[PDB]
Design a protein around this ligand. Structure first.
Ligand SMILES: Nc1nc2c(ncn2[C@@H]2O[C@H](COP(=O)(O)OP(=O)(O)OP(=O)(O)O)[C@@H](O)[C@H]2O)c(=O)[nH]1
Ligand SMILES: Nc1nc2c(ncn2[C@@H]2O[C@H](COP(=O)(O)OP(=O)(O)O)[C@@H](O)[C@H]2O)c(=O)[nH]1
Ligand SMILES: Nc1nc2c(ncn2[C@@H]2O[C@H](COP(=O)(O)OP(=O)(O)O)[C@@H](O)[C@H]2O)c(=O)[nH]1
Ligand SMILES: [Mg+2]
Lengths: 430, 12, 430, 49, 430
């Protein structure tokens, strides 16, 4: 019951899913052949959340994979746990977008999306009670940031009451791999605010910083960043698949973390994270988890959370632990940092406890906090956008496929209005 | 569903 | 020929119902399978040959807790189709569980209530348990109380609500639905007992010497209080008290029926037997402000009426000799228009111990239910918390979009202001 | 302070571009669209008839 | 009892029968030598439906094979199961028609048909209780589309109360193998509507599409198309040869699927169909069968069924399954697609259950639906016919054998009238 379907688009989203599904399968004891080989009874009670049942007793994820080029899905199939995905759900084009947002949203993405919407509708109509959808995509690419966001609007138009999740990677100015990143980032943020019920920003720069400083491993690769993102993704829905002292589905988090409908851009972090050589030194206790959870360097975004004030915060503890300690520590982390918490909403931290810890760990915490410090990312994105747009650089590529500069002006104005009205509440006082 | 306008008026 | 029906709604309600139903089964000698290997009739019913069925119903929209109940050791006890379960949780939204999803479930619950009531011949009244700071709990409790008040009329209903702590909180939006539910049950419930978690945490820490308590330890103390309250209906005693003999002794006026409880002694087996546990010392400990079961200071207000239950080998003359001492003390003062304020009950059955629990076995115990003027502080602080966020209309869109009108928040505020004015008007001397 | 000035100015700039574009575009678009629609309807209806 | 005889004409019909009889023999366990070697008792109880009995214990099909050239029947005899056919039933001419409808219907087909009608009369007069006839032929050829349709009228004139089936392959404009296809298609459709009690259109283009997309086999051949057509053919009469929960002969389908006597052109489809590599992934359940059954790509015709509204539908489930699930799924497939079902006839889906599944499969479904979307095939056929006829191209071949243009004009007018009056009910409202 109350299950969700997985939809991913683009190369970055496909690579994120290729590790997210591996993590989920390892958590539920599903072999790469789709056969259950788990140890505990609880591993099968709520498997309908992510997995479907077919004849022969094997399980198949309800994931939908889409891209405008076939290479990435032809590569993910040969990887581990690549056989679980149903071949029918693979939809792809023969041309690609070339990191051009217009091509992936107006000319090419519009004709292809009917086939993927057909299978999306097939998956949603069938399921017992829908909880919602979760979306993984990147804002630094053309086909992803175009087709995914248009699909968001199409899904929202047909299921207005369901919940919608988006895990979005925004292009940081530090590690830049594409010159046309500001254009399709700014165009995508315009559409994303209007339809997504929840959005979670993730930055490659913050992932590299975490890998270099906390884990202290010499050579980070995309596999480590994907593993961290996958652990963070799994931590959110853990209590929906396992029993606990205070169950809290996604809708309950939506109620408690979004004060106003347009303020739904969160930054997350996962604890504990320790190096291989120091994993024996540390002792896992609730104070040790909560001190690392609110650490500024532990956030999955380069945004500095002590440059603003938290509107609200959430924590999803895992493992068996006493609730009194959790509540007193949450109170203590809020009394010692009163300057960084907005004062006109008292008791702005939500807590939840799940009795099933991750495989290999005795305690774990997932942190989701809505803070005013996120304005800095939109500020720098808009700064680069307006630095590049004033000369009409690279504009002809977009304008040759039916798009105009008016949609750029409206997007810039709406993004600046969002930036302004997000900080409006930072200076608000009672 | 109702939308909240910038003047806090809920309009159907 | 005397019966009572207990209603459990929400996660907290079900988790305290489990706690009370181990205790009752243990106290009446019934095995977890429901089979005995004439006092049971108050809580149970005979099926003709063999097992006993509790006169209880479990309600929740979120299926995890009920599924946990239906697979534990008590799977054989409860009737399979009185554990009403939903599919979609209200997610801490009060408007959801009062207007959207609770209405489709409330009819089945009312049908079950009728089917249980037609069996009873001497129905004393109803008991209801619900944690107030949640969507489904508060909303469904309000709706059930409103339906029962008109279906049955003058039958007595008792509410063991758990209000949020002064500063410790798990959610961020619980003041809104707490205020709305207080509005709903102010004109619909005959008795309401205060049960916030912080006071019981302090009790456990100071007396039981547990530094890491969980919810089960709290629920066991609540279950012991319930058993002490209802012992007089199913055991022989020198001075009996019935449920219907409360509004004539503790409720001076129809509006004022919120009172706070205390229990004594609370002590562990490691140091219980070193001291004699006389009746005087236990009745002194019960009146200590630090042993209140709700985090309120009785020294800040007058007393109106005290109803306090004993059980064990206590002799009435020793009780009178201790009531005199309390009347003597200068730190406890009663209201002017109440010369005598004590109602005393004496029962012979000593409290029963649950194996593996915290409390030890003792021959004397005291449970007090006291109505005092100092309770207005919790209303004032909840009102202050509510006003801070209602000034900017925060989180209101999550309620307006679930069918509730805009003006519904204001009238609850007006009723709380009326209640606070009434409490001040009553406490002044003539 | 300059950030704010630029944002306001950019917003203004957006408006300026939009205004010029909008007026020219609107006039041209309306005339052309009407003519095209009429012709297609026209010829198709007559031949079909 | 209630048995039917088989009559086939032309090369395409002979190739269809060469696989239909192989499928039937494999289903009933009959070796290619006519000796029974089956396992189950039910395999012999109703063998009189298709097979006759001769001395020596061997079985012989009651099939009649006719063509205007001897090559195809001289080739089918050397194939597997070719010895079952009685040599006396082979009737052929020495000239052929050359894909000319006039030659196969006026000059050559008229003189030869007496001999084949003699053996047809011999077969029908003898049998216990006649149910009817089933005809397999192609509309893209001359001798077939001429002699078969004239034989239809001759049979109908002598047995007006029996039922008549025709499985007709119409020439699609996509895969065209003959330039004179529109002429003999249009001429044949004129006569076919007046006499056939049931007609089932099959297209080679749809068969290639199915083979390429659902089975995903690299190199389709005529053997695969014939096998699919044979499975679909066998599925219709399964419950007439085996016991079941709700037996339904051909006449019962005729009553329930034909609202008006001139609307008897159905399109069919068979489920399940899965690739070799995915036959282990899938689990056979009633929802899985019914979702593939109503799939648009699964139809044996290129006509798109969501371009019109179903007048009625039928399903013939096979295997042992619960009827409650079948009925609820049929209701669900009709509530979720109310836009594609005509509204002035409620409950327009017929269901039947047979307890004997196909050999090698546990569940199977045959779908026969009368839809308004079939108009598109006649539209394109008439479009090509009127494009070619306006110049009198290839007309002299037909007019040199006693035919005139008046019979072409009448055929075109009647076909257009059929097209119009078939869609007349699509726009009809209550
Ligand atoms: N004393 C006590 N309080 C509890 C317990 N569990 C939850 N609560 C309280 O209940 C409040 C929230 O309501 P819950 O009971 O957890 O959830 P709910 O009533 O089912 O409402 P939903 O969130 O819609 O499911 C929290 O603030 C807790 O303080 C418990 O086991 N014992
Ligand atoms: N975490 C992670 N990020 C990736 C990976 N591959 C690419 N990216 C990010 O994705 C961005 C490029 O996105 P792109 O591949 O063009 O998206 P597309 O246009 O939808 O295919 C780069 O800035 C990378 O930082 C990966 O394997 N893991
Ligand atoms: N399914 C199937 N169709 C066939 C086969 N052989 C021919 N056809 C179809 O029959 C059509 C030609 O019919 P034709 O042989 O001229 O019929 P005839 O004039 O009666 O002999 C072609 O368009 C083919 O698509 C076969 O073996 N299987
Ligand atoms: Mg709950």
């Amino acid at each position: 019951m109350r299950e969700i379907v997985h939809i991913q688009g683009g190369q970055c989203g496909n690579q994120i899913g290729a590790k997210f599904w591996e993590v989920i399968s390892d958590e539920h004891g599903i072999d790469p052949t789709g056969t259950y080989h788990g140890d505990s009874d609880l591993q099968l009670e709520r498997i309908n959340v992510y997995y479907n049942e077919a004849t022969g007793g094997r399980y198949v994820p309800r994931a939908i994979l889409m891209d405008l080029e076939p290479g990435t899905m032809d590569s993910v199939r040969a990887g581990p746990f690549g056989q679980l995905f149903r071949p029918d759900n693979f939809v792809f084009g023969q041309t690609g977008a070339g990191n051009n947002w217009a091509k992936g949203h107006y000319t090419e993405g519009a004709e292809l999306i009917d086939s993927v919407l057909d299978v999306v509708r097939k998956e949603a109509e069938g399921c017992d009670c829908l909880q919602g959808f979760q979306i993984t995509h990147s804002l630094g690419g053309g086909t992803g940031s175009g087709m995914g966001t248009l699909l968001i609007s199409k899904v929202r138009e047909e299921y207005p009451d369901r919940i919608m999740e988006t895990f979005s990677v925004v292009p940081s100015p530090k590690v830049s791999d594409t010159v046309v990143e500001p254009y399709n980032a700014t165009l995508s943020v315009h559409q994303l605010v209007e339809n997504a019920d929840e959005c979670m920003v993730i930055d490659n720069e913050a992932l590299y910083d975490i890998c270099f400083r906390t884990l202290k491993l010499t050579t980070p690769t995309y596999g480590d960043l994907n593993h961290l993102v996958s652990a963070a993704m799994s931590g959110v829905t853990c209590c929906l698949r396992f029993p606990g002292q205070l169950n809290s589905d996604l809708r309950k988090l939506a109620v408690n973390l979004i004060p106003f409908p347009r303020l739904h851009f969160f930054m997350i972090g996962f604890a504990p994270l320790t190096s291989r050589g120091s994993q024996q030194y540390r002792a896992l206790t609730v104070p040790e988890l909560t001190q690392q959870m609110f650490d500024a360097k532990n956030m999955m975004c380069a945004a500095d959370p002590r440059h603003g004030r938290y509107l609200t915060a959430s924590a999803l503890f895992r493992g068996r632990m006493s609730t009194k300690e959790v509540d007193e520590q949450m109170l203590n982390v809020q009394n010692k940092n009163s300057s960084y918490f907005v004062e006109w909403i008292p008791n702005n931290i939500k807590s939840s406890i799940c009795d099933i810890p991750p495989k290999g760990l005795k305690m774990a915490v997932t942190f989701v906090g809505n803070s005013t410090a996120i304005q800095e990312m939109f500020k720098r994105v808009a700064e680069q956008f307006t630095a590049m747009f004033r000369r009409k650089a690279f504009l002809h590529w977009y304008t040759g496929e039916g798009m105009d500069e008016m949609e750029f002006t409206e997007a810039e104005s709406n993004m600046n209005d969002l930036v302004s009205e997000y900080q409006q509440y930072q200076d608000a006082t009672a | 569903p109702k939308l909240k306008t910038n003047n806090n008026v809920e309009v159907p | 020929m005397r019966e009572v029906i207990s209603i459990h709604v929400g996660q907290g309600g079900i988790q305290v119902g489990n706690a009370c139903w181990e205790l009752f089964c243990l106290e009446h000698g019934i095995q977890p399978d429901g089979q005995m290997p004439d006092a049971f009739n108050t809580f149970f019913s005979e099926t003709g040959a063999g097992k006993h069925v509790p006169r209880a119903v479990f309600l929740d929209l979120e299926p995890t807790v009920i599924d946990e109940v239906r697979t534990g050791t008590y799977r054989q006890l409860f009737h399979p189709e009185q554990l009403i379960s939903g599919k979609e949780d209200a997610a801490n939204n009060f408007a959801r569980g009062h207007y959207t999803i609770g209405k489709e479930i409330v009819d089945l619950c009312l049908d079950r209530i009728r089917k249980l009531a037609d069996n009873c011949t001497g129905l004393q009244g109803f008991l209801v348990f619900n944690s107030v700071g949640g969507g489904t709990g508060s909303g469904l409790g309000s709706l059930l109380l409103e339906r029962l008040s008109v279906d049955y009329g003058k039958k007595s209903k008792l509410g063991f609500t758990i209000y949020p702590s002064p500063q410790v909180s798990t959610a961020v939006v619980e003041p809104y639905n707490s205020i709305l539910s207080t509005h709903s049950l102010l004109e619909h419930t005959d008795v309401a007992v205060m049960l916030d978690n912080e006071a019981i945490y302090d009790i456990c820490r100071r007396n039981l010497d547990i530094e890491r308590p969980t919810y089960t330890n709290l629920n066991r103390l609540i279950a012991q209080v319930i058993s002490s309250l209802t012992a007089s209906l199913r055991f022989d005693g020198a001075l009996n008290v019935d449920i219907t003999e409360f509004q004539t002794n503790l409720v001076p006026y129809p509006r004022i029926h919120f009172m706070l409880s205390s229990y004594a002694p609370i002590i562990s087996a490691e140091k219980a037997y070193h001291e004699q546990l006389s009746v005087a010392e236990i009745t002194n400990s019960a009146f200590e402000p630090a042993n209140m079961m709700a985090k309120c200071d009785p020294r800040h207000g007058k007393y109106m009426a005290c109803s306090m239950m004993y059980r064990g080998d206590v002799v009435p003359k020793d009780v009178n000799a201790s009531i005199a001492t309390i009347k003597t003390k200068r730190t406890i003062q009663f209201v002017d228009w109440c010369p005598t304020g004590f109602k005393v009950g004496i029962n012979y059955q000593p409290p029963t111990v649950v194996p593996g629990g915290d409390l030890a076995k003792v021959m004397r115990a005291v449970c007090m239910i006291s109505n005092s003027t100092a309770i207005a502080e919790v209303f004032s602080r909840l009102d202050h918390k509510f006003d801070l966020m209602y000034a900017k209309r925060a989180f209101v869109h999550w309620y307006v979009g679930e069918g509730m009108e805009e003006g519904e928040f204001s009238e609850a505020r007006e009723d709380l202001a009326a209640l606070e004015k009434d409490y001040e008007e009553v406490g002044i001397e003539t | 302070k300059d950030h704010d000035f630029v944002m306001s100015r950019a917003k203004e700039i957006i408006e300026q571009n939009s205004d010029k574009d909008k007026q020219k575009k609107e006039k041209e678009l309306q005339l052309k669209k009407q003519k095209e629609e009429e012709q297609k309807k026209k010829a198709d209806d007559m031949s079909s008839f």
